[PDB]
Ligand binder design. Structure first.
Ligand code: NA
Lengths: 123, 123, 123
C-alpha cells in the first residue's frame, strides 16, 4: 500500500459556533443525526462538532476536492474502543473509488477553543 | 509495514498553562524530569511543554485511546540534529506491542499561543 | 515505500501577521511571488499566507531541518483539481535526495485565526 492523500483541518471553535448560528440549515447540511449524539443519547457540544466538521474537511483535502463535499455523504463515527472512523457513501465514496483508496486513517481532537483533525488516505 | 493508527492534537498554550497553574502537581503527572527540566536546570517553558503533551496525546490517539496508560510511560526526546522521538515503557510499551507497532513517526510544534503534534504508528 | 519523516505546524494568524508587519522585507524571504499572489494578482491575505508558511515549517520538520529552510527553495502550488503540492529545488531538493525521499504529501488549512499544515515524506 501507498499514501494517496493527506488532509488536515484546524478550526477555532468559537468561529465554527458562530458559523452554525448564521444558518442552521448549516448543521443539517454538515452533520448526520448520528454525529450529533452520543450512544447514550447525550448531545455533542460545539468543540466536538467542530472536530467532526474538521475531519470532513480533512477528508475533502485528502481526496483533493476543491470546494468541500456533500457533507452528509461522509460520516464520522467512533469505535467502541474509542478510535474515530470515517464512513463514506454516494458522492464521497465515488471520489474515493476513482482515487483508489482502500483505507482511511483519521484522528480528531479538541479542547474548548481549538478543534482539529487529520486524515490519511491509502491504497 | 503499514499504518496502524494516526493521532493529532492541537492545544491552546494558555489553556495548558492555566491547567498547570490550577494544579501544581500536574506537571509531574504528565512529564518525566527529563522533559520538565531544560539543560542547566531551568523549568522548560509552558509552550514547549504543551507541544510535548500534545505529542503524548497524539500517541494515545494513534494507539486507539486505550485504558490504563500513564503519561510518564511516554517520553519525548530530541535526537542529534533535532528530530523528536518517542520512547515508550510499561503500560504504553505494552499497548504498542499488542497492536504490533513496529515504529513511530512524530512531529511537534508550537508558537506562543498554539502547540501541536502528529503521530503515525506503523507496523 | 515507507514514511521517512512527518512534519506539522499550526500557527496563530495574528502572530504571523504581526511579524510580517515589523519586518516587511520578510515576506519576500519566506515566499516566492507565486505564493504571495492570488490568481488575480492581488496579495494573498495573512491567514492564507500563514498556511503556506506552516507548510514550509512542516516540510522543514519532515526533512529534519532544525534551523528551517532556505524558504524560497520550496514552493507551495495547487493542482487544477484543488490538491496542494510542494515543489522543491536547490537546497531543499538536495536535502530530500540526501534523505531518500521519493514523494511528498501535503495539506494545508486556515481559518481567520489559525493556519496549519502537515507534510509526510516517503520513499
Ligand atoms: Na512567481
Amino acid at each position: 500500500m501507498s499514501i494517496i492523500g493527506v488532509g488536515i483541518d484546524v478550526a477555532e471553535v468559537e468561529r465554527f459556533g458562530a458559523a452554525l448560528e448564521r444558518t442552521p440549515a448549516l448543521a443539517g447540511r454538515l452533520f448526520l443525526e448520528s454525529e450529533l449524539l452520543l450512544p447514550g443519547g447525550e448531545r455533542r457540544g460545539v468543540a466536538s462538532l467542530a472536530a467532526r466538521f474538521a475531519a470532513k474537511e480533512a477528508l475533502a483535502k485528502a481526496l483533493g476536492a476543491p470546494a468541500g463535499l456533500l457533507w452528509t455523504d461522509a460520516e464520522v463515527w467512533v469505535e467502541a474502543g474509542g478510535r474515530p472512523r470515517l464512513r463514506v457513501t454516494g458522492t464521497v465514496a465515488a471520489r474515493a473509488a476513482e482515487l483508489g483508496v482502500a483505507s482511511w486513517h483519521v484522528s480528531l481532537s479538541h479542547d474548548a477553543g481549538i478543534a482539529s483533525a487529520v486524515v490519511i488516505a491509502e491504497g
